């Protein structure tokens, strides 16, 4: 499992404040902050279209290499802020990472397969925490369900993982649950 960095251009902010941030967002640049173990916080700007394209292409957790006035830095998108209604990228958090580091990254999980007629699939947990080096973080994790019946509680620890990844979350977590199909009587009874 290997991944390649994505290149983007960033500029040093001239002014800081709510007015400046609003003006930049209106213009079409999303403000962001770069901080890490280097003890040297920096706050920059990115191109909204390019950033959105990169996120769409390579998921939420992507390795980014930045061109800061001719200097190259390796950064990871730690967290994002999204407006609940307009659905924009209000702000971004970037963490400096060098090759050969252990990081805690949350990765989404997907469920695919076929179910028996009396089986209904439910997903209690959508994300898990895994520890791996920067360049081998998976973009998606899949779990297969085929011909299960009755109680088939899928445990988080039971998920198959690649090499070089540690399951930070305890094995006690439950991710996917399978229960008998509902009925009209139960549906009517519930909610009254």
């Amino acid at each position: 499992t290997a991944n390649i960095p994505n290149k983007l251009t960033a500029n040093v902010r001239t002014r800081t404040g709510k007015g400046a941030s609003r003006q930049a967002r209106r213009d079409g640049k999303v403000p962001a902050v770069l901080y890490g173990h280097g003890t040297d916080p920096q706050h920059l700007e990115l191109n909204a279209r390019d950033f959105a394209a990169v996120l769409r292409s390579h998921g939420t957790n992507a390795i980014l290499t930045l061109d800061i006035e001719g200097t190259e830095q390796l950064a990871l998108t730690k967290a994002l802020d999204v407006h609940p209604i307009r659905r924009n990228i209000q702000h971004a958090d970037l963490l400096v990472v060098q090759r050969g580091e252990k990081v805690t990254v949350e990765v989404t999980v997907l469920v695919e397969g076929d179910a028996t007629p009396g089986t209904l699939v439910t997903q209690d947990a959508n994300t898990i925490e895994i520890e791996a080096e920067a360049l081998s973080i998976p973009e998606q994790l899949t779990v297969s369900v085929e011909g299960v019946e009755a109680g088939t509680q899928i445990t988080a620890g039971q998920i198959s993982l690649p090499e070089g990844v540690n399951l930070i979350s305890d094995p006690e977590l439950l991710v996917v649950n399978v229960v008998e199909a509902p009925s009209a009587e139960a549906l009517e009874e519930e909610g009254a």
């Binding site: 939420t60 999204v82 609940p84 209604i85 209904l120 699939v121 439910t122 997903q123 959508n126 199909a181 509902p182 009925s183 009209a184 549906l187 009517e188 519930e190 909610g191 009254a192």
Partner: protein, 136 residues
């Protein structure tokens, strides 16, 4: 018909209806859900009507979640009465909702049927609404 078992205080002011919802603005119980846009006081009977409308069309499979509960009361005084002489009595219960709040959540295999049921539900509410999914 959802009502609270008991409340510490039985008569209260009008709930505040300003601002944008902060919590519960993301949908994670199933696959599809509803989010509001306007401000209004959703009633218990409206909630019941929406739930019945969804269920009667979904029929066998799936299940529905409700993320709100009409616990805050409202009062009405007897008609044909002058003003004053004290406050009225509680009549119907409402739930405060703000833009971004997620109301209902449904999980079902078929996207077409799910969206049809959600639209049937939306048509019964007093405010505009939009269908949203689990993925970002």
């Amino acid at each position: 018909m959802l009502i609270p078992r008991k409340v510490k205080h039985r008569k209260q002011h009008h709930p505040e209806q300003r601002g944008i919802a902060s919590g519960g603005t993301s949908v994670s119980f199933g696959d599809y859900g509803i989010q509001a846009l306007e401000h209004a006081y959703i009633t218990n009977r409206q909630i019941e009507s929406a739930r019945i409308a969804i269920n009667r069309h979904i029929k066998r499979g799936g299940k529905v979640w409700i993320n709100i509960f009409p616990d805050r009361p409202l009062t009405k005084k007897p008609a044909e009465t002058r003003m004053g002489s004290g406050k009225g009595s509680p009549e119907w219960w409402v739930a405060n909702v703000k833009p971004g709040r997620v109301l209902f959540e449904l999980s079902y295999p078929d996207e077409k049927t799910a969206r049809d049921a959600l639209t049937r539900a939306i048509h019964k509410l007093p405010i505009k609404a939009r269908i949203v999914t689990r993925e970002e």
